[PDB]
């Protein structure tokens, strides 16, 4: 339903991950760490006790209806998605895992380079037109890609795909694909991709004309 | 050592039946609580079912109550999850987890299995369609130009996309596959190169799809 | 001033009534099960649409220069509201009565398709029950070119008795007995249920303390057995109210399961394990009250809002029927009687404004936004 | 009483924006704290936000050298989300917020002549930090030279 939240922090920082409960939490939350492609691992159980194999840097706090996970000295193996097991409320499921807080490497802001790829001649024979808008090497992750066709905003016919944070420069990448039928592709002339980012003063627009 | 080994995942059409097995070793499954947790591709953890073999009590999530039927076999030391009337959203990775004590599932699930992937889709095995995303002719003369091959409408995952048989690695970004509304996956693979090499260097994407045994080598030019 | 005071009073009722009832319909689309309230507001909406026409007759003091067909339609709509409103109020009372007294047999009945059909039947019975209005809605042969629009009974000196009583019996007497009887059986069941859930819950707390002091497997086994019977007893006891079955029933699957988990460990002789499993129930009890209190607070709001809407109608029109029945004994009205009769109708049609306001005021979320708007507008 | 009561009119709007406690509209920003400073000095800027509560939105910073574009400088997201800096200003600059005063500060240290520009402020209208800038201040000239 809700995407995992992002919490950018560097090595050596003190991070605090918080989940919010509907009632007074009483030592009933456990924090799970899941690296991409691995099964989750229990970090703190009973909301205050150390787990076996878990260093003392992890520690669970409890402030009102908010329970927090504290990492005293962030380490390069601690960059993963952290899930919170909500305290049980009557009528819900037995176990409910709250949304995750993805901890990622903090770095300087880089604006996204925008490229657009017009559909080829071969693809138009299949009866479908795909327009690809590329966002290259940007940080932070949050960005928005807008599709304009003859200055008309599209909606519900595009899919985005963001790569994982790069292992060398800690940047991202994105590509938006506008799927159109061959008949609808010829009805317009101007296709554009409007990109707005935290590091962009003004939206960056790249456009091409059919033919 | 506590180990949870799983199997049974695979392809199944909507409305089909699939029984997942979670073999448990290092402990007696009778005095334990086996919990099934699934994680949809790109989504968070979701709890599915639980069973206490010693007591026989069995809990289900709302979304799977009446469709799934979790059970345990103490003789074979395994826990089963019989799935019936599968839907599109039942596609996920199913983990089986147990708490330290059979009654401490509210303090955390200490031990987890490796997980099995269940893919529910009515589409048939279809090879990929490779389309070239030609680089812009009017790009930065001394800067960087990006080109790539669009792999569209293939099933099932994955397709291994490499450029020049692995000779080109710098600047290559193979985006995760996105499930189209028609049930067929599609991904892109763009590579950024200096514009001076467009007229001389040859860029060929090697799209390989094992399940269909399809090998495609496509050339991209302005 | 006094001569034109009465037409101005009814104009204020029309203005506030249309705005108030429109807000209620807008709020429900954007308490009662979102069906009877909309239909009840339609009755107010339709009646208030015909209100300005009758106000013109008051200024003319017996002038109906609008057409004979209009007189039959408008006068029927004025007399249609009393039957239609109480039938809907009776329907809402019975709908809440079945859902709280006979929930098993009313599960099929309580459907949006069925409920919508019932409203049309109530409107159909409303037009049939106002049959004398249709028969004697002809223009009164007032002297001169003016024509009155009233009820022209064949024997007004003698036929007045049955016409007045038949309206009082069907529109006020019969529904009041049904509604009051419905809401005393509802509150007896609700008080019995809400005294049952906390009675079985108090059985959990008393036994949950015994487990901690227990020193043998026999005490733990017997203590949990009392809890299990109380848990199952409270599970079936949830099926006695409408907003207490779809929310407070799913939780007991976990609670009964956890008692079985602890009870099974007690039979095995694992006394230490049984107490550890039993100690996990202090979070189930802690989640028992925090959900029960929210539901118990929510099940009073539904009943109080339903009763307040019903009680407003039968109190606004109560003084009017006091004078109407009294004038049967005292045929000749006095000077005070004229003022009292005018005051009776003013409170009678105030039901068009109190019902939308009472429903809005009792909604805690709705009134909160209005207070915030006043603070911003005050500046 | 005009002067004192107009300060209470501005004080009234502060409490009225507290009562708004949401989206509202039409937020005004005013830079300050610009002046000549020798290389290696220190300066602090400020932007007072009025008409809305910036405790729900992220306040960014931009600069524009003459004959150049508006390169990014720093962004100060909501408390607990951290602050990100551009490559050139990393280490030397520091942006901090004050939700109570609806004011953001750009604590600048170790200035260089290359940093001479107009430091335009901005408030991110989007609550997801998507970069939806819709309001700006007039900017304050900052020049570094001995
Ligand atoms: C007893 C009762 C109970 C309920 C309703 N239905 C509602 O309460 C709605 C839910 C809002 C209607 C009635 C009677 C219907 C027959 N009625 C006769 C009458 C009409 C008109 C008039 O003279 C005015 C003419 C114009 C006016 F605007 C006016 F206020 C009075 C005198 C007398 C008396 C009321």
Q: Is the sign of the CA dihedral C47, C48, C53, C54 positive or negative?
A: positive
**CA neighbor of C36 nearest in space, from C250, C279, C355:** C355
Partners of residue B60 on adjacent β-strands: B49
- In angstroms, how far is CA A37 from the centroid of its own chain? 16
Method used for this model? cryo-EM
Q: Which residues of C297-322 are buried (b: 16+ CB within 10 A; e: fewer)?
A: eebeebbebbbebbebbbebbeebbe
Helix (H, G, I), strand (E, B) or coil at C144: coil
Which residues of D fall within a CB distance of 8 Å from A202?
70
Written as six digits, the tokens of D146 are 């001995």
Using the Cβ of C368 and the Cβ atoms of chain D, whether some distance falls under 8 Å is answered with no
**Look-up: residue for tokens 């399809």?**
B214
Q: How many CB atoms lie within 10 A of CB C28?
A: 15
Written as six digits, the tokens of B2 are 């506590």
Partners of residue B5 on adjacent β-strands: B23
Using the Cβ of A28 and the Cβ atoms of chain C, whether some distance falls under 8 Å is answered with yes
Which residues of B fall within a CB distance of 8 Å from C277?
102-103
Helices (H) and strands (E) in chain A, counts: 2, 17
- In angstroms, how far is CA C326 from the centroid of its own chain? 30
Q: Do A201 and D75 touch (CB under 8 A)?
A: no
**What separation in angstroms does the CA of B145 have from each of B136, B148, B163, B197, B219?**
7, 10, 16, 9, 16
Residues in chain C: 379
**CA neighbor of B111 nearest in space, from C16, C115, A32, C344:** A32
- What's the rounded Cα separation, in Å, for the pair D45 and D62? 12
Using the Cβ of C374 and the Cβ atoms of chain D, whether some distance falls under 8 Å is answered with no
- What's the rounded Cα separation, in Å, for the pair C199 and B164? 77
Helix (H, G, I), strand (E, B) or coil at D28: strand
Sorted by sequence, the CB contacts under 8 Å of residue B109 that are 6+ apart come out as A30, A32, A42, A95, B35, B37, B97, B98, B99
Which residues of A fall within a CB distance of 8 Å from D58?
198
- What's the rounded Cα separation, in Å, for the pair B83 and B70? 8
Written as six digits, the tokens of B191 are 């590579």
- What's the rounded Cα separation, in Å, for the pair C23 and C356? 8
**Which other chains touch chain A, taking contact as 3+ CB pairs less than 8 Å apart?**
B, C, D
**B175 CB-side CA count, 13 A:** 31
- What's the rounded Cα separation, in Å, for the pair C254 and C271? 22
- What's the rounded Cα separation, in Å, for the pair A110 and C218? 70
Partners of residue D37 on adjacent β-strands: D144
Q: How many CB atoms lie within 10 A of CB C102?
A: 11
**Look-up: residue for tokens 């203005």?**
C15
Number of the ligand 1 atom closest to the C-alpha atom of C321: 1
- What's the rounded Cα separation, in Å, for the pair A208 and D41? 48
Q: Is the sign of the CA dihedral C379, D1, D3, D4 positive or negative?
A: negative
- What's the rounded Cα separation, in Å, for the pair C185 and C125? 26
Q: Is the peptide bond before B156 cis (omega within 30 degrees of 0)?
A: yes
**C331 CB-side CA count, 13 A:** 5
Written as six digits, the tokens of B170 are 């710098």
- Given a contact cutoff of 8 angstroms between Cβ atoms, the answer to whether C88 and C119 are in contact is yes
**B108 CB-side CA count, 13 A:** 23
> φ, ψ for residue A91 (rounded to 5)?
95, -15
- What's the rounded Cα separation, in Å, for the pair A206 and A195? 9
Written as six digits, the tokens of B155 are 């099933």
Is C79 near ligand 1, meaning CB less than 6 Å away?
yes
Q: Do C283 and A94 touch (CB under 8 A)?
A: no
**CA neighbor of B217 nearest in space, from B149, B169, B170:** B149
- What's the rounded Cα separation, in Å, for the pair D130 and A197? 6
Using the Cβ of C265 and the Cβ atoms of chain B, whether some distance falls under 8 Å is answered with yes
Q: Do A90 and C288 touch (CB under 8 A)?
A: yes
Which residues of B fall within a CB distance of 8 Å from C257?
52, 55, 57-59
Pairing of strands A58-63, A66-71: antiparallel
Q: Is the peptide bond before A140 cis (omega within 30 degrees of 0)?
A: yes
- What's the rounded Cα separation, in Å, for the pair D126 and D75? 14
Q: For C43-59, give the DSSP string.
A: HHHHHHHSHHHHHHHHH
**CA neighbor of D29 nearest in space, from D128, D144, D125, D131:** D125
Q: How many CB atoms lie within 10 A of CB C18?
A: 18
Pairing of strands B3-7, B18-25: antiparallel
Choose the mutation target among D78, D131, D134 for the interface with A, i.e. most A CBs under 10 Å. Answer: D131
**CA neighbor of C296 nearest in space, from C180, C193, C205:** C193
Q: Is the peptide bond before C265 cis (omega within 30 degrees of 0)?
A: no
Helix (H, G, I), strand (E, B) or coil at D87: coil
- What's the rounded Cα separation, in Å, for the pair A135 and B190? 10
Check residue B168 and report its DSSP letter. Answer: B
- In angstroms, how far is CA C211 from the centroid of its own chain? 46
Written as six digits, the tokens of B178 are 């996105």
Helices (H) and strands (E) in chain D, counts: 1, 11
- What's the rounded Cα separation, in Å, for the pair D96 and D116? 21
Is C125 near ligand 1, meaning CB less than 6 Å away?
no
Pairing of strands B116-120, B11-12: parallel
Written as six digits, the tokens of D103 are 């004011």
Helix (H, G, I), strand (E, B) or coil at B212: coil
Written as six digits, the tokens of D99 are 């939700």
> φ, ψ for residue C60 (rounded to 5)?
-75, -15
Check residue A119 and report its DSSP letter. Answer: P
- Given a contact cutoff of 8 angstroms between Cβ atoms, the answer to whether A104 and D91 are in contact is no
């Amino acid at each position: 339903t809700q995407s995992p939240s992002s919490l950018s922090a560097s090595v050596g920082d003190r991070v605090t991950i918080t989940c919010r409960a509907s009632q007074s939490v009483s030592s009933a939350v456990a924090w799970y760490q899941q690296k991409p492609g691995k099964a989750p691992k229990l970090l703190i159980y009973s909301a205050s006790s150390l787990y076996s194999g878990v260093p003392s840097r992890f520690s669970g706090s409890r402030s009102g209806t908010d329970f927090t996970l504290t990492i005293s000295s962030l380490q390069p193996e601690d960059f993963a998605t952290y899930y919170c097991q909500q305290p049980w409320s009557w009528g819900s499921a037995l176990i409910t895992f709250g949304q995750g807080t993805k901890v990622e490497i903090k770095r300087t802001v880089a604006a996204p380079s925008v490229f657009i790829f017009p559909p080829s001649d071969s693809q138009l024979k299949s009866g479908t037109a795909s327009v690809v808008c590329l966002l290259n090497n940007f940080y932070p992750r949050e960005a928005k890609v807008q599709w304009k066709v003859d200055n008309a905003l599209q909606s519900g016919n595009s899919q985005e795909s963001v790569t994982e944070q790069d292992s060398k420069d800690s940047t991202y990448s994105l590509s938006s694909t506008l799927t159109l039928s061959k008949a609808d592709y010829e009805k317009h002339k101007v296709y554009a991709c409007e990109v707005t980012h935290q590091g962009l003063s003004s939206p960056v627009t790249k456009s091409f004309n059919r033919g | 050592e506590v180990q949870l080994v799983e199997s049974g995942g695979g392809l199944v059409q909507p409305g089909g039946s699939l029984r997942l097995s979670c073999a448990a070793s290092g402990f007696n499954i009778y005095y334990s609580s086996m919990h099934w947790v699934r994680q949809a591709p790109g989504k968070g953890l979701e709890w599915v079912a639980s069973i206490s073999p010693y007591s026989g009590s069995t809990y289900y999530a709302d979304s799977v109550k009446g469709r799934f039927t979790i059970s345990a076999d103490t003789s074979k030391n395994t826990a089963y999850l019989q799935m019936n009337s599968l839907r599109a959203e039942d596609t996920a990775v199913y983990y089986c987890a147990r708490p330290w004590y059979p009654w401490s599932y509210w303090s955390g699930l200490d031990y987890w299995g490796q997980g099995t992937l269940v893919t529910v889709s009515s589409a048939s095995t279809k090879g990929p369609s490779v389309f070239p995303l030609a680089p812009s002719s009017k790009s930065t003369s001394g800067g960087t130009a990006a080109l790539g091959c669009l792999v569209k409408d293939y099933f099932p995952e994955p397709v291994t996309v490499s450029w020049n048989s692995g000779a080109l690695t710098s600047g290559v970004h193979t985006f995760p596959a996105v499930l189209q509304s028609s049930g067929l996956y599609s991904l892109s693979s763009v590579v950024t190169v200096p514009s001076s090499s467009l007229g001389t260097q040859t860029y060929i994407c090697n799209v390989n799809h094992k399940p269909s045994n399809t090998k495609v080598d496509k050339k991209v030019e302005p | 001033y006094i001569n034109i005071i009465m037409p101005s009073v009814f104009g204020t009722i029309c203005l506030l009534g249309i705005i108030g009832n429109s807000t209620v319909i807008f709020a429900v689309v954007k308490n009662v099960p979102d069906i009877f309230i909309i239909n009840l507001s339609v009755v107010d909406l339709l009646f208030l649409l015909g209100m300005p026409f009758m106000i013109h007759q008051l200024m003319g003091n017996g002038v109906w220069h609008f057409g004979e067909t209009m007189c039959t339609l408008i006068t029927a709509m004025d007399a249609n509201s009393q039957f239609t409103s109480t039938y809907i109020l009776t329907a809402m009372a019975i709908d809440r009565y079945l859902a709280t007294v006979h929930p098993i047999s009313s599960t099929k009945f309580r459907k949006p398709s069925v409920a919508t059909l019932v409203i049309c039947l109530l409107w159909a019975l409303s037009f049939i029950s106002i049959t004398p209005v249709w028969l004697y809605a002809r223009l009164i042969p007032f002297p001169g070119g003016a024509v009155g629009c009233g009820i022209r009974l064949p024997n007004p000196d003698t036929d007045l008795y049955w016409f007045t009583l038949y309206q009082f019996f069907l529109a006020f007497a019969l529904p009041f007995v049904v509604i009051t009887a419905a809401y005393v059986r509802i509150l007896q069941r609700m008080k019995r249920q809400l005294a049952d859930l906390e009675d079985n819950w108090e059985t959990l707390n008393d036994n949950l303390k015994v487990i901690e002091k227990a020193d043998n497997a026999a005490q733990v086994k017997d203590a949990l057995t009392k809890m299990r019977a109380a848990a199952l007893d409270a599970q079936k006891a949830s099926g006695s109210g409408s907003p207490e079955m779809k929310d407070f029933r799913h939780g007991f699957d976990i609670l009964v399961g956890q008692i079985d988990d602890a009870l099974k460990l007690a039979n095995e002789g694992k006394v230490k394990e049984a107490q550890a499993a039993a100690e996990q129930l202090k979070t189930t009890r802690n989640a028992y009250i925090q959900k029960y209190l929210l539901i118990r607070l929510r099940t009073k709001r539904v009943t109080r809002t339903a009763i307040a809407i019903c009680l407003v109608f039968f109190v606004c029109w109560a003084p009017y029927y006091v004078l109407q029945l009294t004038q049967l004994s005292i045929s000749r009205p006095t000077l005070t009687f004229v003022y009292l009769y005018n005051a009776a109708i003013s409170l009678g049609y105030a039901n068009s404004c109190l019902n939308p306001f009472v429903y809005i005021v009792l909604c805690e979320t709705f009134r909160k936004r209005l207070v915030l708007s006043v603070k911003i507008a005050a500046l | 009483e005009i002067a004192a009561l107009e300060k209470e009119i501005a004080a009234l709007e502060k409490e009225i924006a507290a009562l708004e406690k949401g989206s509202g509209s039409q937020v005004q920003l005013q830079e300050s704290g610009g002046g000549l400073v020798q290389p290696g000095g220190s300066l602090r800027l400020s932007c007072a936000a009025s008409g809305r509560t910036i405790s729900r939105y992220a306040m960014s910073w931009f600069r524009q050298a003459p004959g150049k574009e508006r390169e990014f400088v720093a962004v100060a997201r909501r408390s607990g989300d951290g602050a990100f800096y551009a490559d050139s200003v990393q280490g030397r600059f520091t942006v901090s917020r004050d939700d109570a005063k609806n004011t953001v500060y750009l604590q600048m240290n170790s200035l260089k002549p290359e940093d001479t520009a107009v430091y335009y402020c901005a408030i991110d209208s989007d609550t997801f930090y998507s970069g939806s800038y819709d309001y700006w201040g007039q900017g304050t000239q900052v020049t570094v030279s001995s």
